[PDB]
């Protein structure tokens, strides 16, 4: 299984692209629980924001930089090799990684905001044409999470 993980707003603007979502904590716990025990493919600029492997999960970094190394990170150099990774693979970037991967993935975990982010970076369009809602849960508002958000889980429509 190849899954997207993304957070975005009512205009599909990605919030704090490349970073762990320290600014939406419900979402950082959601990421934690999905990818633990599994494989996280990240854009290079995503790994460099973080700066070290996440524990308990296979960390894979996509980069065309021959000298890249980090202890506990597996490297891939092209899109094509992601479809070769074993187990449950999660794809976490990065606008161009999402455009490249959106028609390839089986499913999508999307955190959606009633609200606005500041960025210039966009998740690709998706419609009820191609996707179905397997799950839709309103996130818990409190002091740490004060923007209204839903966790969607969409699966590509098969057969």
């Amino acid at each position: 299984t190849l899954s997207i993980i993304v957070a975005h707003d009512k205009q599909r603007v990605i919030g704090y692209q490349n970073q762990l979502p320290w600014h939406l904590p419900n979402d950082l716990k959601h990421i934690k629980q999905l990818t633990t025990g599994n494989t996280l493919v990240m854009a290079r600029k995503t790994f460099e924001s973080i700066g070290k492997p996440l524990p308990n999960r296979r960390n894979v970094v996509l980069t065309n930089q021959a000298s890249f190394h980090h202890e506990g990170v597996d490297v891939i150099n092209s899109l094509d090799e992601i479809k070769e990774l074993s187990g449950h693979v999660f794809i976490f970037g990065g606008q161009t990684l999402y455009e490249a991967m959106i028609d390839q993935v089986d499913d999508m975990y999307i955190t959606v905001i009633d609200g606005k982010f500041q960025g210039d970076t966009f998740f690709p369009p998706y419609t009820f044409e191609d996707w179905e809602v397997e799950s839709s849960v309103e996130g818990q508002l409190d002091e740490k999470n004060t923007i209204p958000h839903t966790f969607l889980h969409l699966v590509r429509r098969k057969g």
Side-chain angles (χ1 to χ4, degrees), residues 17-20 40-52 61 92-94 97-98:
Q17 218 195 62
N18 302 314
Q19 315 186 44
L20 257 15
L40 178 55
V41 179
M42 85 221 82
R44 166 56 163 309
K45 245 195 158 289
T46 306
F47 182 79
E48 269 158 12
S49 160
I50 310 179
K52 75 142 165 278
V61 175
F92 187 55
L97 172 58
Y98 296 138

Side-chain angles (χ1 to χ4, degrees), residues 15-27:
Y16 291 68
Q17 218 195 62
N18 302 314
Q19 315 186 44
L20 257 15
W22 286 116
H23 56 87
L24 198 58
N26 262 358
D27 205 41

